[PDB]
């Protein structure tokens, strides 16, 4: 679907943006535009990929004119620019509002003005039953995206969103913490052995975005079905992959869709599709055993490498 | 404490603003300013109170210059301007952000610039564990109020907030609607019989706002303790008072089954101050508070004049 | 001409907006959008009409983005959002400028951007020979609308306006004040018995807007011809309909800022206006008042009063 | 009253601003700031006056920040920046609103923020019974000025206004047209000989602004009493002064409305309209002799 | 190329705008819109040309809505609105930025929204190697114009620029000063006799704009090749044409902030420039200045001066 | 002059900002506020320094309200927020204008409104005889800083600036490239052997800012005198140390050099030629002593 087309990714210097580049840079796509504020991160990527298809635009989604110019001639937009950290959003909620909410309004308005064909907005499980300023701002962003998706019937723009939770082995998460502790001979620090988390990789997320991109109608929100595991099972599976069963250990659920969303949702195989108008959480989804957890971990390249005595990040 | 002071109420044409006028207009306060957008409502209100202490300002809290201008020479502000209806905010969430969040940032910034001494912001229980755009926007508003309340260490401005739920015998609430349905001989329309609500009056909310006004520290949020009841117990108690011993519809979209005034997180830091909790800046809900039975519910209803009028 | 079309009324929760719904809602129009600021009023309207064709948009004409979003996919706009009260505007003239003038520029620019086919702007007789801030701002609005309409030759947007004065039995006007005073046994309070007003119903106003809507060219202002009456003759006609011919009347005296006649077209306008039967058309450049129009006697005034259901019920 | 004070004139490059400069530059005022958009006019003016007391600010009254910055440390403001031509305003009424109404709002807000002591706003007779966009916009400007002047009780700022009509020997006005037509041997172009205009000089206008400046209270509008003449009387007196007798050849201006006249204070040479009919037809009529004596106040005519 | 078309000139009340009007007003062009802030200058022009083709718009290029509105139905735009005086920009550099940079951005965005076919932006030699706030701001404008000229591939708008220095017999310049001083028998005031300037008439500038208008691709900057001369040679050629070969000259000294040459293309630009006959074309990605271009001798300088109607008149 | 004061650094997450913290965090200063846009960098710094004196503000200098808010209660500001990369500014000159010029206008205007006492602005040698969008934008910023510094006589705010070039062993500079190229076994990639650069460390840069902070008058720009070296002498001295045996920058224009005050180790350009070819040239021995000021170099 990307042949001779132009894709723009807001927040493209982030982990998502990189995942998308690695998949698409050497395909038949014409151009990938990276839109973000930071010139150092953009320079590093330029050198890392050394690809003529990769165009970099300095800009801020808070700035309508900026995004309006970057989206001239663009076919598709992946909207991933956000403030995503909990403490900074707690202390500067206006900043979260300006970026996540007003920023989102700008990209969509620019997309509509420039006749962009498709826009996918990335959202988080923290938006379902939100408890802090970051989560709240993402919940508000969804509401905004859905309202904006109305009246585009004559026009040729489809806007929809995807929602996913934390991905395995992202920065400062449990898996790289456990791996380090095992490498350093330290006991694993475990809060609650029975705390459950959804388990999905960064590749799975890219697939979720690709699915929404192909199948979405205005205002749709897609969620990918994901299995879950307890921290107990995660630690056990990891000690077995790294050959340290005889290794010391020292001693609550996330939701992807609310009850309300569940009653209206379409089950579409590996995805739920929530059309615009029990909970689905890590406790009641498919539970992984150690063997199934080991298969998921082995989808991480740094972990495959460890079982060979190789070390990469 | 209001003697010869100037009070400005944003959203002053609403039910809150009226309750505040009825209490304070004929006391020793120098001036009450009503700041809102609607010329019709202001005109009606002006005729109703016909008081020289009552000054009217047309303006929108979305307009910084406008609120900056009206708060020149003001000592205290009750910030009550909001979009508060659920369906309206769901279909227009940007309007809720512009009014509830950005509008609040404007009022607070104007207050700081004009050396206003105290501001109390009104919030709702729907901001706790919010599930709809209205509640989400109010939750965001609380965070902004709190964040703005820091760095005022040099300045002589105090900002705090209050949070309360639905009041009994309000314009479009359950009690006058049930009475109205009976007057028309129709069965009572109930969404969820097992739904609990805090039972509280407009008078109590004014007390709550006055309480925060006297005692608040920067970033404080006050909540008033109240008993609760199911709509079932409420409907039953009202039928007994009216001597006429129901249609169950469904739980409506974006409507919880209980109201929450403090989250689990807040409950941990909150100070219990007798009839109020005080949440300082940086679980308590209608399900686990004092539950009223038909007898307890009746003794409350008989304190409401709108009900007294009907039993007499 | 409205079949399967989308109409948006800015200021749609007002009396004009309601008259338009009562006429068009149950016709073959596709959708009517109401655009205004107050959620309370919109909610009442929604319950009142209970129609799937009626869509509500919260927004302010001061906000370009807001009206730009509400007019996407719209065919026609009736622009009726205004601040119209005289005392309120004298103390806050910037608010009048912001809503009446800048708000009008916003709706028109949005209309041009969303390729809306026709926009009719509602104006008032107070724009003719204006003496106060409300009136001054409405005069400026007409000029802004007219200037905006001289830019559209490449585009498929037509912009024009209508001008009319108060409608009979509007809120806080003379007729319901008299009816009330009669019901409560009080003498009728009259300021100046010889004061004349144009006599015109709310249905007549909808017809005027429809006329402009059908026949308007860029920058036109349309005015509907109407008879007038003194308050004396109005009071007499009403007392007879209510069978209270000998009911006292109190001559209070002339109010601050209340004229004795209204003008619908100025002398300068009459020189250029085209007589088109029941309407005048003032073309854009690129005296007609209540004293000298057709004067009604009591019998004529009674036939007009009987057009109001509010009065019919009383007989 | 200007001793060691700072005066800012918006629209200072105009004919009024130059009249004020000619008057005040060589007094004990500390500084006169000229605030306007045109670098050309400001440069010529700098060269013409070659004075260290004369400071120039490029800026637009539509730009709040610009005027906020230019008025830091200013004691007094004469607000004279406006769009004034009638045809220009009919075709671009938004520019008139932006400059005359919103621009004025900015100057007053800037003056209030910077604690400027006095602001006098210049207005026109075309604002009384306005019939066109230029006049309507000036009428709006007065209402805005008056409304802003309420709430200054805590503050030490006084805002008021002046209103006057066309001045004699201004550019493209009646006198230089008649002078030019005689120079070119052409007959005098008269629309209506029986139409009356107030007769007043540029120096008189400067006096009017100084009067309001000294005596004004919040929201006051001052008007200067002036005699009037028919264009007929004007042509004759002018033909006689130039020794070219027997040479081939609204309808009045109003300075106070009926409503204002009821509330106005007669203060000798001035009316003072306090915040809440006088026209050229019914004011003192000049005959040919009185017109000649006025025309001789123009040095331009003496030659 | 102007038949039945609509042309808009920002800054149309200035000297360039007049030269374009004198040239095109009485041709088959449909309409010329003059867009500027000053009602006085516009009224003067209106009377001067008395042409039904000449339409006036009040507005500021700093105001996006104003220019958006003025360019509806416009085919071509000559963008000549600027703040161009050196002292003025030094004390208010923000005003230079607001008008020259943000104003240019507004005009270009308006042109794109209204589907204007071509825009030519006028720039100055002071943008090459800029040393003061006026020049610095004009350099920024070119960068902004070039950057905006990208991504218009789908759209049917072309944006390009021209750069030129002072033209002969413009206001407050050397020639009308010398001509006046001669008529009053006063000696000619010369700062630095060896200072070289490019020699180029107002008509040449119009041709340069017309050329850029016909030939430009997005982001192009055109420069017209021009010979140069010293003030010494300028004074001598003029003294001979006016028949005052024996006319006193006062050497004041080199003036503050006045260079001895102007540059039209930098070394870096010359490396990338295309030679197109009478013009250089710098595409969007030796120094070329008045010292190293063709020197005019007195005789060749006479032939240039004789192109001015103002000078031809005096030899009669 | 820092005792119990509040310092705010715009762009505080940069290499300069980190240098200032390393120096001042554990002194008797009351508070250091870091104002920048990036939550990731701010978080890492919070973790790295773990100090209660270090406050973080998310904000953009393009946003007047944001900077107005973070400067409430601030005594001194180091304005170091900029876009400084050349290609990036060539393709996006409006972003350079918005951040470097309008952003600077916002900081000073907020500084004035909140009665900040002293503001020092950081500028670059590329503002002298500028040739590309980044440099042009910085030159404009100086003009804006200087113009803003007039009219402050009544107010208790002083604004001034500093200008310096690339510092030794900065990211993507000549030195770490040479070290890395030996590390990857390739001979060193040299553009022009004869090209001169001023030779200066990050610590010297902090001193320059401290100097301006102590001595600045309204509209002043300070430059620190520094020696220079050929790329040859730079390359040669390092190869001896490592045991493996345009073309100049300008700091003051001819125009500035005429009015500049010589103040010992600094030039002070008051409001209204000095380059790397004609400054003190280091030989291999002098270059050796300078390279040894880098801990990055000492360690090897
Ligand atoms: N593990 C996950 O990846 C995860 C989990 C749950 C939800 N999500 C959601 O998926 C989205 C993508 O997440 P991510 O992991 O890729 O986050 P990320 O790594 O932090 O990337 C965010 C990027 O957004 C850019 N950005 C921030 N503010 C901007 C602005 N005002 N204008 C333009 N660009 C701006 C930043 O680039 P610059 O600093 O260069 O400007 C930043 O690199 C997020 O919105 C997130 O809520 C992700
Ligand atoms: N059950 C309850 O009533 C309840 C419960 C908990 C908390 N609260 C909170 O108490 C506050 C007010 O209570 P309420 O019952 O009196 O609400 P209300 O009756 O709806 O009155 C709100 C007022 O705000 C004004 N307003 C809305 N938008 C504005 C704007 N953009 N600028 C200026 N004024 C604006 C409206 O007046 P105009 O239309 O004239 O502009 C309206 O009169 C609300 O913030 C609400 O969240 C209410
Ligand atoms: N060799 C040199 O690098 C050199 C030499 C002389 C002078 N200077 C000047 O000194 C400063 C550079 O210092 P530096 O190199 O140590 O830091 P830096 O690495 O260049 O980073 C500067 C910081 O500015 C922040 N920033 C960028 N745009 C911003 C904005 N719009 N609002 C708020 N913050 C913003 C960035 O932080 P976030 O991404 O977190 O927002 C960035 O970390 C610049 O002014 C530079 O021109 C540099």
Residue numbers in the entry:
A (entry chain B): 1 to 251, 260 to 285, 306 to 341
B (entry chain D): 1 to 245, 249 to 285, 307 to 336
C (entry chain A): 1 to 286, 307 to 335
D (entry chain E): 1 to 249, 259 to 285, 307 to 333
E (entry chain C): 1 to 285, 306 to 336
F (entry chain F): 1 to 245, 259 to 285, 307 to 334
Wording from the paper:
The enzyme WbjB (like CapE) is bifunctional, first catalyzing the 4,6-dehydration of UDP-D-GlcNAc and, subsequently, a C5-epimerization step.
The crystalline packing showed a hexameric organization in 32 symmetry, i.e. organised as a trimer of paired chains (A-E, B-D and C-F). No density attributable to substrate could be identified in our structure solution. The Ab-WbjB protomer contains two well-defined domains: the largest encompasses a Rossmann fold, comprising residues 1–165, 200–224, 266–286, and a bound NADP+ molecule. Several hydrogen bonds play a role in docking the adenine ring (engaging side-chains D60, T99 and V61), and residues R37 and K41 contact the 2’-phosphate of the adenosine ribose. A reciprocal interaction via K40 of chain A stabilises the coenzyme bound in chain D. With six coenzyme molecules bound across the hexamer, these hydrogen-bond pairings recur across all remaining protomeric interfaces, so linking chain B and chain F, and chain C with chain E. Given these interactions act to tether non-dimeric protomer units, binding of coenzyme NADP+ can be seen as integral to locking-in the hexameric organization of Ab-WbjB. However, no tyrosine group occupies the required active site location in Ab-WbjB (Y141 in FlaA1); notably this position is instead occupied by a methionine (M134) side-chain.
